[PDB]
Amino acid sequence: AIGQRIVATLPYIKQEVPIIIVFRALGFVSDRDILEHIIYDFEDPEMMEMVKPSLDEAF
Amino acid sequence: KDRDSQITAIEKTFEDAQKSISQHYSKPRVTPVEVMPVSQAMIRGMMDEEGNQFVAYFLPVEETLKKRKRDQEEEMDYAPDDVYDYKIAREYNWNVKNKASKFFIFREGDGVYYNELETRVRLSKRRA
Amino acid sequence: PGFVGIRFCQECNNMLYPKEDKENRILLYACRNCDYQQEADNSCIYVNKITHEVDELTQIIADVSQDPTLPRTEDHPCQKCGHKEAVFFQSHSARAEDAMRLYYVCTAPHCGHRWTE
Amino acid sequence: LLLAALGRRELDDRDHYGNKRLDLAGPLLAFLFRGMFKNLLKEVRIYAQKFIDRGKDFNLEL
Amino acid sequence: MIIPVRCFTCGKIVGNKWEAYLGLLQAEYTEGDALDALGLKRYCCRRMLLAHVDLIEKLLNYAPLEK
Amino acid sequence: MDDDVFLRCIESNMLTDMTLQGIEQISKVYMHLPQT
Amino acid sequence: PAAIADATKIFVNGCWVGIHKDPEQLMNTLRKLRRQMDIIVSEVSMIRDIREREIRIYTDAGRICRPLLIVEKQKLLLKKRHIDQLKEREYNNYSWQDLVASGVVEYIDTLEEETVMLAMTPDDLQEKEVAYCSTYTHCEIHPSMILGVCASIIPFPDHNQSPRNTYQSAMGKQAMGVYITNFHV
Amino acid sequence: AKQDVIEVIEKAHNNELEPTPGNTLRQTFENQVNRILNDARDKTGSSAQKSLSEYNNFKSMVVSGAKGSKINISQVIAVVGQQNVEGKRIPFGFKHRTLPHFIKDDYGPESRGFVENSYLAGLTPTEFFFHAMGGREGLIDTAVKTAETGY
Amino acid sequence: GNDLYFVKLPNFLSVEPRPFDPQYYEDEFEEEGRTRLKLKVENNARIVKWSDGSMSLHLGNEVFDVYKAPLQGDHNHLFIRQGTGLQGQAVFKTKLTFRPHSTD
Ligand SMILES: [Zn+2]
Ligand SMILES: [Zn+2]
Ligand SMILES: [Zn+2]
């Protein structure tokens, strides 16, 4: 809608799933933990704003 | 199987190695020239640091700082892990503490005699 | 202007979203999971660089000087260490049209200075 | 994915043979053998089930 | 499989030269000098001897059908 | 919706649909002298 | 995760197994290990991507690779002694595997070729009035080995138009000859 | 021609090259390089064509129109020329390289598929592979156009 | 006298570190058993030097052609460490470097 959303087409599932939902389903609920796993350099706001829509879509 | 055949077969090589040889194994076309008859402890060296345990590597006939490599133990809990260094004096030379780096068999021309002196444990030393 | 980074709550470690306090007429960053709030210090909430004026020297890493497949030159010495040799390469990055520009890196170990002519 | 979307990495080439693998006689016969051994174990399961349901031993050779 | 009888081009007989050619080659002749010794002066007959592959020698490694 | 989100939305829209000059559906135009 | 920023990822058969701090001397160690026929076997591919800090190691099957001559500072490791021992291959049983075990030859896969700087011939390793590379890592054994079985029969294929070489490579397969020695049975 | 291409490369590397209207800087550099190399190919072909005698049999068959063209004579005598894949120079199929034998980011003529040899001179291994790529393009075109044209 | 006489024999050719003496030898070992007895009967040694330069091993009727590989990776100082002096009286003979690989 507002920005570019990241989705994940898992096997045996016929609907796209947000990546943040998959991360939480694996036990990583805090957004900090998920971006620790995704973004390894926190000095880089470009990656951050490009992942932000996915977080905003899964709250 | 049996020992009366093992005794004679082990002596058999000790006897056959001393006969006349004039031919190769695959193609007997190459004539022989000469023969080289056959505990121990070798200090390995790192190829970058380039270690001079002896005076040979230092390009020396004899020790210009010693006369006898008195290979003495590093401690009481290290028989194979001694401390080899070329220092006849209590001087603070290159203290090469040969750590325990635990077949590499060695032999020599012992006056054209039949023996062996295979190595016990490959040690390697550094500059301590 | 510069970009704006994401900031997380101090309790739930979720991202802080922007909010406005009418009472003081001031920007706040508040968590929509917990009830944490924070006084902003930048006052800027969003930044879009449409021109994409990115300094690609920041994207380069000195380790690239170890690449045997990159070209080396002796004509551009390093301004930081004085080493003569240096690897050079083009941008090869999308969203960069004028990408024939060359970026240089010093091959001296532990210097790793990077620059552009 | 973000590095590709940010232009910091190149898209991967489908045709690059570094991205490909050659399925040779061994790994192909292995695919067959997995399918066929699974079918065999299945048939053994039905055969042994129809015997133990009667509460008696069975000959695996049959 | 076997040395041809005639040269395909001129019709000179080369069938009687294969064995002599091999004997000259083991006599440390070069292939050119060997071909000169046998009298093959046209490059067609030199082609015949020089490019021949004696496959019959390999076919004679198999036992016949009858003993 | 809150104001800031509305500003972001109209920003993303204006940057795409706000036709300052030209005719829609015409991406690029090249002017030249025909030699033929 | 804070350590992953400056560190180099290590993938093995696609699985991210860990991270490392000095990828260069890791690659040196691993290449030494593979060239000594130590724990790493010859067919293992080990690619260091430098700009992105991955080190990808592959041991799985199906990776097409080819042998190449390793190059020292600007010299081949294939010295004349190896050629000497190869000339008497039928007496001293010095074979190809001894050439590979000597660390003189290496199998490089398509993905590790991206990180390799090849010399087409040892003439490329000569110091030139203007050096092209001066940091080669491997050399071709011979460029003609880029051809297959049927293209390796074309004489002077580099003087033909390439479609002609393709048509011959197809037509060498319909050519008559002796398809096999035991055709009588 | 190779020195001219080197000069254009040096200009592009120093940002001394400005794009022409209707093209990006990459496309302008490619246009300049391709123009230089096409000029080289045409000049060398003209040199070969003028070198031919009245007894030349290539010239005989081309003159009568029985078979061949002046470009074929140029490729047999002078230079085979630029190999193109999809109307562009040889692509960087490796990482910023056309082959592992070149340095990264090498837009020179030999790196990107200019065959500076003739068919009588013989192609070098990289020229051989690039020429095989260009010829594969023609084989694919011939084998793929048939279904659509017949339909 | 002081020349390199180093050799590296594989597991199935491990010769005895001491001369063969009837008071140090005993019968303990027996296609399966055929490779077993060959460890303590065929394994004293005479490294023949030929004219081509290569060497060969002579421990009976069979000849194993060996190749004196010269290694610059294991430059260990080989020495007769006999228990007599302080701690293993290493006698300075020859530094091991070149390893000769015997094989059938
Ligand atoms: Zn919170
Ligand atoms: Zn520097
Ligand atoms: Zn004839």
CB G27 within 8 A of CB G115: no
Q: Which domain, by its residues, includes E4?
A: 1-67
Q: Write out chain C residues lying below 8 Å of G117, CB-based.
A: 68-69
Identify whether residues C113 and C94 lie together within a single domain: yes
Q: How many domains are contained in chain E? A: 1
**DSSP assignment of H20-46:** PTTS-HHHHHHHHHHHHHHHHHHHHHH
Evaluate the CA torsion angle H18, H19, H24, H27 in order and state its sign: negative
What is the chain G residue with the closest CA to I71? G102
* Neighbour-count burial of G96, counting CB atoms closer than 10 A to its CB (0-12 exposed, 13-18 middle, 19+ buried): exposed
Residue pair I37/B1 in contact (Cβ under 8 Å)? The answer is yes
Three-state secondary structure call for residue I69? strand
Three-state SS letters, chain E: CCCCCECCCCCCECCCCHHHHHHHHHCCCCHHHHHHHCCCCCHHHHHHHHCCCCCHHHHCCCCCCCC
Measured in angstroms, the CA of C50 and the nearest CA of chain F are apart by 10
> Which of D3, A10, C17 shows the shortest CA–CA distance to A18?
A10
8 Å CB contact between I97 and I72? yes
Please check whether residues C115 and C58 belong to one and the same domain. Answer: yes
Gap from CA of C19 to ligand 1 centroid (Å): 13
For residue C85 the two structure tokens come to 């040799």
Q: Give the C-alpha separation, H15 to H31, whole Å.
A: 16
H38 touches C: beta carbon within 8 Å: no
Residue A2 in contact with partner chain F when CB distance is under 8 A:
yes
Tell me which chain D residues have a C-beta less than 8 angstroms from the C-beta of C95. Answer: 7
Terminal-residue alpha carbon distance, chain F: 59
In three-state secondary structure terms, G66 is strand
Task: Tell me how far CA of residue F23 lies from CA of E37, F13, H87, I83, in angstroms.
Answer: 91, 18, 32, 100
Chain C contact probe: residue of A30, A44, A57 with most C CBs at under 10 A: A30
Q: How far from each other are the two terminal CA atoms of chain E, in whole angstroms?
A: 23
> What separation in Å is there between the alpha carbon of C107 and the centre of ligand 2?
7
Backbone angles phi, psi at G16, to 5 degrees: -70, 110
Specify whether C67 is located in the same domain as C87.
Answer: yes
Name the token pair of A22. Answer: 């998959």
Q: Which DSSP symbol is given to A7? A: E
Cβ-based neighbours of B121, under 8 Å, separated by 6 or more: B41, B80, B100, B101, B102
| Tokens describing residue B96 | 């090469």
* Chains D and G are in contact, defined as 3 or more C-beta pairs closer than 8 angstroms: yes
CB B36 to CB I82 under 8 A?
no
Closest residue on chain H to C64 (Cα): H104
Which three-class secondary structure state does DSSP give residue A51? helix
Question: What part of H 49-68 touches C (C-beta under 8 Å)?
Answer: none
Q: How far is G74 from chain E (nearest CA, A)?
A: 40
Record: contact C50-F4, CB cut-off 8 A: no
The whole-angstrom separation of Cα I13 and Cα I16 is: 10
Of C79, G147, E3, E7, which is closest to residue H125 (Cα–Cα)?
Answer: G147
Q: Are H67 and H61 in contact (CB under 8 A)?
A: yes
Neighbouring chains to G with at least 3 Cβ pairs closer than 8 Å: A, C, D, E, H, I
Cβ of I80 within 8 Å of Cβ of B47? The answer is no
Which among C20, C46, C50 is the nearest to F8, CB-wise? C46
Please give the DSSP secondary-structure letter assigned to residue D18. G
Question: Does H142 contact C at CB distance below 8 Å?
Answer: no
**Cα–Cα distance, B112 to B17 (Å, whole number):** 12
Per-residue tokens: H8: 């254009």
* In a shared domain, residues C44 and C90: no
C9 annotated binding-site participant: yes
Instruction: Find chain A residues with C-beta within 8 A of F8's C-beta.
Output: 2
Interface test with D, best of H86, H90, H95 (most D CBs within 10 A): H95
Query: What is the C-alpha separation between E18 and E48, in angstroms, rounded?
Result: 10
Q: Which ligand is nearest to the CA of E45?
A: 3
Question: Does C40 lie in the same domain as C53?
Answer: no
- In 3D space, the residue among A18, G2, A49, A38 whose CA is nearest the CA of residue C7 turns out to be A49
Chains A and G touch (3+ CB pairs under 8 A): yes
- Ligand 2 centroid to Cα of residue C75, in Å, is 13
Tell me the residues of A at the C interface, defined by beta carbons under 8 Å apart: 30-33, 35, 42, 45-46, 48-49, 52, 55, 59
| Residues C23 and C67 placed together within one structural domain of the fold | no
**d(Cα A48, Cα G52) in Å, to the nearest integer?**
19
Give A7's contacts (C-beta < 8 A, 6+ positions apart): A16, A17, A18, A19
Q: Please indicate, yes or no, whether residues C43 and C92 belong to a single structural domain of this protein.
A: no
Q: Calculate helix-pair angle for G162-171, H125-150, nearest 10 degrees.
A: 80
Q: Is D18 exposed, middle or buried (0-12, 13-18, 19+ CB in 10 A)?
A: buried
CA distance linking residue I66 with residue I7, whole number of Å: 9
Structure tokens at H53: 């005698």
Residue contact G133–C64, C-beta within 8 A: no
Report yes or no on chains B and D touching (3+ CB pairs under 8 A). Answer: no
Among C41, C36, C42, smallest CA distance to C13 is for C36
Q: What is the rounded CA–CA span in Å between residue B21 and residue I63? A: 11
- Chain E residues close to G181, C-beta within 8 Å: 55, 58-59, 61
Residues facing residue B99 across a β-bridge: B124
- Show Cβ contacts of residue B111 under 8 Å, excluding neighbours closer than 6 positions: none
Same domain, C73 and C21: no
Using CA atoms, how far residue B101 sits from B78, B128, G178, H37, I99, in Å, is: 12, 15, 61, 64, 19
User: What residue has token string 């896969």?
Assistant: G109
Domain match, C68 and C98 both: yes
Resolution expressed in Å = 3.0
Q: Token digits for A54?
A: 């996915």
Q: At what angle do helices A31-38 and A45-57 cross, to 10 degrees?
A: 130
DSSP of G102-164: TTSEEEEEHHHHTT--EESSGGGGS--SS-S-S---EE-S-GGGGS-TTGGGSSSGGGS-HHH
Say how many CB pairs under 8 Å bridge A and G. 7
Number of domains making up chain C: 2
Are C3 and A42 in contact (CB < 8 Å)?
A: no
Same domain, C57 and C43: no
- DSSP for chain B, please give it: --SHHHHHHHHHHHHHTTS-----SSSTTPPEEEEEE-----EE--TTT---SSTTTT--SS-SS-S----EESSSS-SSSEE----SSS-----B--B----EEEE--SSS----EE-S--EE--B-
Tokens for H14, please give them: 């120093």
Residue F6: strand, helix, or coil = helix
Residue C26 sits in the same domain as residue C73: no
Residue burial C13-41, b: 16+ Cβ < 10 Å; e: rest: bbbbbbbeeeeeeebebbbebeebeeebe
For the beta carbon of residue G64, count every other beta carbon within 10 angstroms. Answer: 11
Beta strand I89-92 with I63-66: parallel, antiparallel or unpaired? unpaired
Between chains, do A59 and C5 touch, taking CB under 8 Å as contact? no
Q: Please indicate whether, in this complex, the C-beta atoms of E55 and G181 are within 8 angstroms of each other.
A: yes
Q: In sequence order, what E strands does chain A have?
A: 7-8, 17-18
Print the domain residue range for C112.
Answer: 49-117
CA F12 / ligand 1 centre spacing (Å): 28
Instruction: State whether C75 and C110 are in the same domain.
Output: yes
Q: Distance (Å, rounded) from C-alpha I19 to C-alpha B114?
A: 7
Q: Is C51 on the interface with F (CB under 8 A)?
A: no
Distance A16 CA to ligand 1 centre (A): 28
The response to whether C111 counts as a known ligand-binding position is yes
DSSP G10: E
Q: What number of residues does chain D have?
A: 62
Q: What is the DSSP letter of D2?
A: H
The residue whose two tokens read 């007894």 is: H55
* 3-class SS of residue A22: helix
Cα–Cα distance measured from residue I97 to residue A56, given in angstroms and rounded to the nearest whole number: 67
Strand C17-21 with B123-124, pairing: unpaired
Domain C-terminal end among C15, C33, C48: C48
G50 neighbourhood in chain C, CB within 8 Å: 61, 63-64, 66-67
What does the alpha-carbon distance between residue H138 and residue H129 come to, in Å, rounded to a whole number? 15
CA D61 to chain CA centroid, nearest Å = 26
Q: At what angle do helices H2-13 and H25-51 cross, to 10 degrees?
A: 170
Chains that touch C (3 or more CB pairs under 8 A): A, D, F, G, H
| Residue G52 contacts A, CB cutoff 8 Å | no
Distance CA H79, CA H49 (A): 12
Among D17, D20, D27, beta carbon nearest to G61: D27
Strand G65-70 to G15-20 pairing? unpaired
The contacts of residue I35 (CB under 8 Å, 6+ apart) are: I12
Chain F CB within 8 Å of residue H22 CB? yes
Q: Which helix (H) or strand (E) holds G17?
A: strand G15-20
Name beta bridge partners: G19.
Answer: G9
The CA-CA-CA angle for residues B92, B96, B101, to 5°, reads: 160
Contact H80, H131 (CB under 8 A): yes
- Are I79 and I91 contacting, i.e. CB atoms less than 8 angstroms apart? yes
What is the bridge-based pairing of β-strands I46-50 and I55-58? antiparallel
Interfacial D residues in 1-40 facing A (CB < 8 Å) = 1-2, 5-6
Contact present, C and D (at least 3 Cβ pairs less than 8 Å) = yes
* Residue environment code for G65-83, b if the CB has 16+ CB neighbours within 10 A, otherwise e: bebbbbbeebebbbeeebe
Report which residue type is found at C73: T
Rounded to an integer, what distance in angstroms lies between the CA atom of residue G8 and that of residue G10?
7
Q: Are H69 and H62 in contact (CB under 8 A)?
A: yes
Q: Please tell me if residue C96 touches chain D, with a CB cutoff of 8 Å.
A: yes
- For residue C29, the ligand closest to its alpha carbon is 1
Nearest CA in chain F to A56: F5
Q: Distance (Å, rounded) from C-alpha H95 to C-alpha G48?
A: 13
Q: Which of G46, I76, H43, E12 is nearest to B122 (CA)?
A: I76
G50 in contact with chain C, both atoms CB, cutoff 8 A: yes
Q: For residue I6, give the 3-state DSSP assignment.
A: strand
CA–CA separation, H102 vs I50, rounded Å?
Answer: 48
Non-local CB neighbours of H131 within 8 Å, separated by 6+ positions: G161, G162, H80, H83, H115, H123
Of all ligands present, the nearest one to the C-alpha of C8 is: 1
* Closest-CA distance of chain E to residue G177, Å: 10
| Helical (H) or strand (E) element with G55 | strand G55-58
How many other CB atoms are there within 10 angstroms of residue G34's CB atom?
A: 21
DSSP conformation letters of chain C:
-------B-SSS-PBPEEEEETTTTEEEEE-SSS--EEE-SS-------SS----TTTT--GGGGG-TTS-EESSS--TTT--S-EEEEE---TT-SSTT-EEEEE-STTT--EEE-
- Report d(CA D37, CA H47) in Å as an integer: 71
Using alpha carbons only, give the angle E52, E53, E58 rounded to the nearest 5 degrees: 150
Residue length of chain F: 36
Residue G134 · residue C72 · CB < 8 Å: yes
**Ligand with smallest separation from the Cα of C10:** 1
Using CB atoms, list chains with 3+ pairs below 8 Å to chain B: I
φ, ψ of residue C115 to 5 degrees: the values are -155, -170
Give H57-115 as a DSSP string.
HHHHHHHHTSS--HHHHHHHHT--EE--BTTBSPP--SSS-SSTTS-SS--STTTTTEE
D25 is written with which tokens?
Answer: 């006689």
What are the structure tokens assigned to A48, written together? 């951050």
